[PDB]
Amino acid sequence: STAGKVIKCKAAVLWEVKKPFSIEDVEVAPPKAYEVRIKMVAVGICHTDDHVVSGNLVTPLPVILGHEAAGIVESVGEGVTTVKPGDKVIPLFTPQCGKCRVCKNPESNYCLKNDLGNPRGTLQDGTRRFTCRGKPIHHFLGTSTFSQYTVVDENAVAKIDAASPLEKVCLIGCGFSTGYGSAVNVAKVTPGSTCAVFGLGGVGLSAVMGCKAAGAARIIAVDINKDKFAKAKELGATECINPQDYKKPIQEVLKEMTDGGVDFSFEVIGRLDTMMASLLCCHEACGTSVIVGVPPASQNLSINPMLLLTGRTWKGAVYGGFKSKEGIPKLVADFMAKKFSLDALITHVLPFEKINEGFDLLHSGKSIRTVLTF
Amino acid sequence: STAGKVIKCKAAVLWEVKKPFSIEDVEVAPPKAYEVRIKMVAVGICHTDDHVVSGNLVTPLPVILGHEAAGIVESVGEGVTTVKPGDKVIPLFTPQCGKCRVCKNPESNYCLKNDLGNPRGTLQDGTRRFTCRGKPIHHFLGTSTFSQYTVVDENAVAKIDAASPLEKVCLIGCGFSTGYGSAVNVAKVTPGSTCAVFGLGGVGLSAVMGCKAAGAARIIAVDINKDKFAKAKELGATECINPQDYKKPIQEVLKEMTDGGVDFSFEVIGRLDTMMASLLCCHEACGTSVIVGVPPASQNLSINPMLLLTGRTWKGAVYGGFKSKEGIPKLVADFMAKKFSLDALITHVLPFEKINEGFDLLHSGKSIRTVLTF
Ligand SMILES: [N]C(=O)C1=[C][N+]([C]2O[C]([C]OP(=O)([O-])OP([O])(=O)O[C][C]3O[C](N4[C]=NC5=C4N=[C]N=C5[N])[C]([O])[C]3[O])[C]([O])[C]2[O])=[C][C]=C1N1=[C]C(I)=[C][N]1
Ligand SMILES: NC(=O)c1ccc[n+]([C@@H]2O[C@H](COP(=O)([O-])OP(=O)(O)OC[C@H]3O[C@@H](n4cnc5c(N)ncnc54)[C@H](O)[C@@H]3O)[C@@H](O)[C@H]2O)c1
Ligand SMILES: [Cl-]
Ligand SMILES: [Zn+2]
Ligand SMILES: [Zn+2]
Numbered sequence: 145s146t147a148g149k150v151i152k153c154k155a156a157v158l159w160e161v162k163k164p165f166s167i168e169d170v171e172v173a174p175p176k177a178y179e180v181r182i183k184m185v186a187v188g189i190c191h192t193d194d195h196v197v198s199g200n201l202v203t204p205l206p207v208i209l210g211h212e213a214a215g216i217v218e219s220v221g222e223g224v225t226t227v228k229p230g231d232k233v234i235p236l237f238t239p240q241c242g243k244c245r246v247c248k249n250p251e252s253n254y255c256l257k258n259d260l261g262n263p264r265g266t267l268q269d270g271t272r273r274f275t276c277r278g279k280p281i282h283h284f285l286g287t288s289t290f291s292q293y294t295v296v297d298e299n300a301v302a303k304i305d306a307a308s309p310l311e312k313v314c315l316i317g318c319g320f321s322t323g324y325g326s327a328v329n330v331a332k333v334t335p336g337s338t339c340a341v342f343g344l345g346g347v348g349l350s351a352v353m354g355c356k357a358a359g360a361a362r363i364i365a366v367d368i369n370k371d372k373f374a375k376a377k378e379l380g381a382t383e384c385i386n387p388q389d390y391k392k393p394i395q396e397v398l399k400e401m402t403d404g405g406v407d408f409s410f411e412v413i414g415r416l417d418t419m420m421a422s423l424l425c426c427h428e429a430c431g432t433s434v435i436v437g438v439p440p441a442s443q444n445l446s447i448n449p450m451l452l453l454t455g456r457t458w459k460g461a462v463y464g465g466f467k468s469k470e471g472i473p474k475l476v477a478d479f480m481a482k483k484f485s486l487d488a489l490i491t492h493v494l495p496f497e498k499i500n501e502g503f504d505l506l507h508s509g510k511s512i513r514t515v516l517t518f
Numbered sequence: 519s520t521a522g523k524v525i526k527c528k529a530a531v532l533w534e535v536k537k538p539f540s541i542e543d544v545e546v547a548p549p550k551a552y553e554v555r556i557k558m559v560a561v562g563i564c565h566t567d568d569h570v571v572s573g574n575l576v577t578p579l580p581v582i583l584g585h586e587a588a589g590i591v592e593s594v595g596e597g598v599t600t601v602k603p604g605d606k607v608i609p610l611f612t613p614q615c616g617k618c619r620v621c622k623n624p625e626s627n628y629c630l631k632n633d634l635g636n637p638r639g640t641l642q643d644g645t646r647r648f649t650c651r652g653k654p655i656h657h658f659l660g661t662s663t664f665s666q667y668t669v670v671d672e673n674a675v676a677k678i679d680a681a682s683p684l685e686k687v688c689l690i691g692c693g694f695s696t697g698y699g700s701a702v703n704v705a706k707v708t709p710g711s712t713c714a715v716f717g718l719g720g721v722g723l724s725a726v727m728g729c730k731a732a733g734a735a736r737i738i739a740v741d742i743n744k745d746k747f748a749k750a751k752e753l754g755a756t757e758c759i760n761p762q763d764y765k766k767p768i769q770e771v772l773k774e775m776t777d778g779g780v781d782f783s784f785e786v787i788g789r790l791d792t793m794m795a796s797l798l799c800c801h802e803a804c805g806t807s808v809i810v811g812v813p814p815a816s817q818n819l820s821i822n823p824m825l826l827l828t829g830r831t832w833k834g835a836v837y838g839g840f841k842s843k844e845g846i847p848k849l850v851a852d853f854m855a856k857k858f859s860l861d862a863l864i865t866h867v868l869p870f871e872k873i874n875e876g877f878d879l880l881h882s883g884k885s886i887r888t889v890l891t892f
């Protein structure tokens with residue numbers, strides 16, 4: 145095996161913002177106690193990965209990005225009980241340490257041992273495991289799955305069904321769980337209700353799916369890129385509207401179209417103007433607006449506090465409200481049991497080496513999710 | 519007798535903003551079909567009334583203010599089937615019109631016939647029922663209880679228990695129902711949780727009581743007026759914090775005091791800095807922040823949407839989430855069932871003619887609720 149030995153493999157390093165990925169040869173040190181070394185089989189490109197490339201999300205450079213993924217355990221460190229080598233696993237962008245405030249709370253999932261809050265770029269011990277040209281490389285959200293091998297803490301890796309199609313199931317690691325849990329667990333969309341979803345990406349369309357499973361009688365899907373509408377209708381939307389077709393602001397069009405406004409609105413893009421439209425379009429006495437998109441670093445919204453006073457609920461969440469180590473394995477089992485399908489979401493599969501192309505298909509709005517294979 | 523004809527009474531007419539109320543002789547027209555003329559027995563001075571006097575809440579002038587009240591049914595107009603003459607009744611500042619969207623929705627309470635959204639200052643039909651000096655006077659929130667007689671719509675009136683201490687129970691017409699319902703029905707406080715309450719006025723203290731009736735294990739009362747703390751301790755707060763004692767910002771004080779922040783925050787004052795400090799003092803990953811105070815006109819908060827993505831909820835509510843025509847009767851009956859006391863909150867009683875003196879006691883911070891009798 146390679147167990148106990150520093151592996152040398154290919155990985156894509158981002159040496160600085162707004163520039164392409166460099167496929168480098170890196171050394172991945174052995175897992176320490178309670179750490180798992182994972183062999184990557186497939187990874188998806190989530191838009192949060194792009195946010196670090198543009199400068200919208202801040203984290204220390206150079207770094208190896210990636211978090212929506214699935215692979216097999218090469219070795220485990222001492223103490224690792226939940227997984228044996230050879231296990232199929234999905235690494236988690238937010239852990240479930242089980243012992244913290246947020247973790248013993250039945251309704252919360254943003255565990256304290258995360259690296260989104262104040263990004264260190266290391267693993268939980270404050271150390272890094274990758275070296276490229278003798279220089280130490282930074283981790284991203286403790287996962288850094290854009291490498292042929294990665295080391296993640298044990299509380300951040302989930303063991304899934306041994307019959308899992310890892311070329312599909314990786315989307316449950318970030319995209320699908322987030323969009324579907326936003327509807328089903330964060331907003332708790334009622335049967336017979338009316339929802340509006342802004343942005344029809346891999347995380348957006350999963351929310352349209354989540355609302356139809358909850359029983360929403362109407363799912364108006366909003367996107368400026370009209371080519372996404374056909375997939376949206378197939379997956380559940382009843383109406384698809386495009387902002388640029390009207391001379392009057394989208395929240396108004398939506399109130400008039402729905403006798404005051406929808407009951408649940410979902411923002412799954414990341415811009416401030418659409419976060420405002422999403423609050424503004426749900427009914428002032430009975431709407432719940434949910435923020436799923438990651439906003440630009442340090443930008444601020446200006447809301448009139450009176451908008452919330454008549455009865456609105458505004459909130460957001462990470463991972464579609466899912467506690468990660470427990471939630472991702474059960475969703476993989478529902479996949480196994482054919483309760484939902486991920487096929488319409490994966491529009492492209494490219495080899496790892498073609499990663500910079502993957503990021504270009506997201507910039508041209510030609511893809512929903514591109515899967516890089518190793 | 520009076521039934522069917524213009525009564526002449528004394529009323530507190532606000533003619534100009536930030537000017538004294540005048541006690542005038544006004545003519546109260548008879549109730550049209552589905553209206554009720556009530557003889558006032560006692561009223562509470564709520565801080566919202568003072569927002570109209572200050573010019574913080576715009577409404578058409580001249581107007582007779584007042585909305586926290588209790589009285590006796592004098593003549594009911596034709597078609598009225600819920601109340602008969604002589605019955606004890608409490609006016610409602612938010613109606614329960616039975617058939618509108620919000621009314622038909624089990625979770626919401628801000629019914630469409632309210633006059634807060636865009637005030638007309640009339641009853642639910644575009645007409646006013648008071649005249650004074652040859653001029654018509656506007657109604658406020660369709661109740662206008664600072665008059666010896668007032669005509670209200672039928673769906674904005676609830677029948678309460680016959681033996682009700684009208685000079686106590688009138689609190690349930692805003693102050694008590696708001697604070698208590700805000701914790702019990704809007705936040706939905708949990709057994710064992712930690713709550714924080716900004717503002718210890720009649721509404722705030724009914725919220726301190728609400729957290730205690732929900733089983734909040736720790737309740738932290740916040741106020742710049744240190745004389746409110748004994749009442750607050752008495753009614754349920756485990757600690758009282760005075761912002762001016764610290765060299766540190768108050769949310770920081772509270773987060774350090776609760777291992778991350780409180781579970782539920784309630785802002786019951788109407789100021790943008792406290793409104794901000796309440797969202798910030800709740801835990802980023804699981805706290806719910808509820809706006810109960812009424813904000814000044816056209817004032818805006820800046821908010822980094824990232825504050826909500828980690829898992830915070832922000833919502834507001836009018837009336838404590840109570841569907842008015844029904845909630846208020848039931849609460850009166852729980853009061854009658856000897857399940858709570860309103861005495862602690864009442865700190866002064868004055869004859870109606872003393873109205874301006876009563877607004878002054880609010881302003882001097884010596885009072886909580888002050889009742890004016892007829
Ligand atoms: N929270 C959480 O968890 C999350 C979040 N996230 C987010 O989301 C968003 C989005 O993503 P995606 O889906 O992946 O991507 P895409 O594909 O790109 O999509 C987008 C869309 O949108 C649209 N638009 C734009 N613009 C516009 C629109 N629409 C309308 N309007 C306008 N203006 C386009 O076209 C498309 O379609 C982002 O932000 C992200 O970030 C995700 C995930 C999740 N995570 C978290 C983490 I820390 C990581 N991950
Ligand atoms: N949601 C609604 O249905 C509803 C209903 C009634 C009242 N209200 C609003 O609730 C708010 C309070 O109502 P009230 O009638 O109980 O008024 P109140 O005057 O008796 O209470 C205000 C309290 O806030 C305290 N306070 C003021 N500035 C403070 C500061 N910077 N920090 C801490 N404490 C401060 C004051 O000392 C006072 O104790 C008002 O805005 C009123 O308009 C809303
Ligand atoms: Cl008139
Ligand atoms: Zn992601
Ligand atoms: Zn934890």
Ligand SMILES: [Zn+2]
Pocket residue numbers: 613614615616617618619620621629630631
């Ligand atoms: Zn109604």
Ligand SMILES: [Zn+2]
Pocket residue numbers: 564565566585586692693
């Ligand atoms: Zn009031």
